[PDB]
Design a protein around this ligand. Structure first.
Ligand SMILES: CC(=O)N[C@@H]1[C@@H](O)[C@H](O[C@@H]2O[C@H](CO)[C@H](O)[C@H](O)[C@H]2O)[C@@H](CO)O[C@H]1O
Ligand code: CA
Ligand code: CL
Length: 219
């Protein structure tokens, strides 16, 4: 039985394009008995530990080509400044070597059918999906950390590749929450999907990602 998660409904004027992003500090234990912080492994971390170093940035309308694979860095145990893809509407360089990111909003299928998602993580990616898994319809800011058991849990090195299948409907916006951490050095945040009856994967979310107003009525 393919999973069939709950979605949301909204009048078009209450809909805007793209996801919300918040960026959080994630320090090294030390910079110039390993150097990187193992905190990200604690089970309380994705629920509330991820905020305890404070945040440093946010953006909105995050759309299109949101994945990356940064494997060019030469040095470990050291903060390295680099830019996010332009999909993030976030101009400043970040400590790509060590940071945490949460992306939330809604995935809207273009056709009713079965979707397969594929994620590849360095270091850590969590995938929550559905009004009863990610967050409440039209109440994203209040319920953002009330997510359920993960639909996918990818951690480098040993659990770094994951996939999942969900059956989805044209007329519904599905709450979606993507948690990413880099503890150190190289950074990979790859979230792709296969639409229904489609053999080739895509990493372009353009036309699929939306935000609804936080009215709180289930819309
Ligand atoms: C070339 C090499 O082996 N460099 C090592 C790093 O692998 C290692 O850091 C880890 O790198 C992996 C990717 O392979 C991953 O991104 C981890 O997050 C990261 O900690 C590092 C140990 O601190 O030493 C480098 O020299
Ligand atoms: Ca890493
Ligand atoms: Cl659900």
């Amino acid at each position: 039985h393919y999973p069939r998660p709950e979605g949301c409904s909204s009048p078009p004027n209450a809909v805007s394009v793209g996801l919300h992003m918040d960026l959080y500090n994630y320090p090294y234990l030390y910079v110039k008995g390993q150097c990187w912080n193992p905190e990200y492994q604690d089970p309380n971390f994705p629920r509330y530990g991820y905020k305890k170093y404070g945040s440093f940035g946010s953006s909105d309308h995050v759309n299109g080509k949101i994945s990356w694979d940064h494997n060019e860095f030469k040095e470990g145990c050291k903060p390295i400044m680099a830019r996010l893809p332009t999909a993030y509407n976030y101009p400043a360089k970040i400590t790509f070597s060590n940071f945490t990111m949460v992306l939330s909003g809604y995935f809207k299928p273009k056709s009713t059918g079965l979707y397969k998602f594929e994620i590849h993580a360095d270091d850590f990616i969590l995938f929550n999906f559905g009004s009863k898994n990610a967050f409440e319809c039209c109440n994203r800011e209040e319920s953002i950390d009330n997510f359920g058991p993960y639909v996918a849990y990818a951690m480098w090195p040993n659990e770094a590749d994951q996939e999942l299948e969900v059956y989805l409907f044209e007329d519904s916006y599905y709450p979606i929450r993507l948690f990413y951490n880099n503890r150190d050095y190289h950074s990979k945040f790859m979230v792709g999907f296969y639409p229904p009856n489609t053999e080739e994967i895509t990493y372009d979310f353009d036309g699929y990602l939306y935000m609804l107003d936080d009215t709180g009525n289930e819309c």
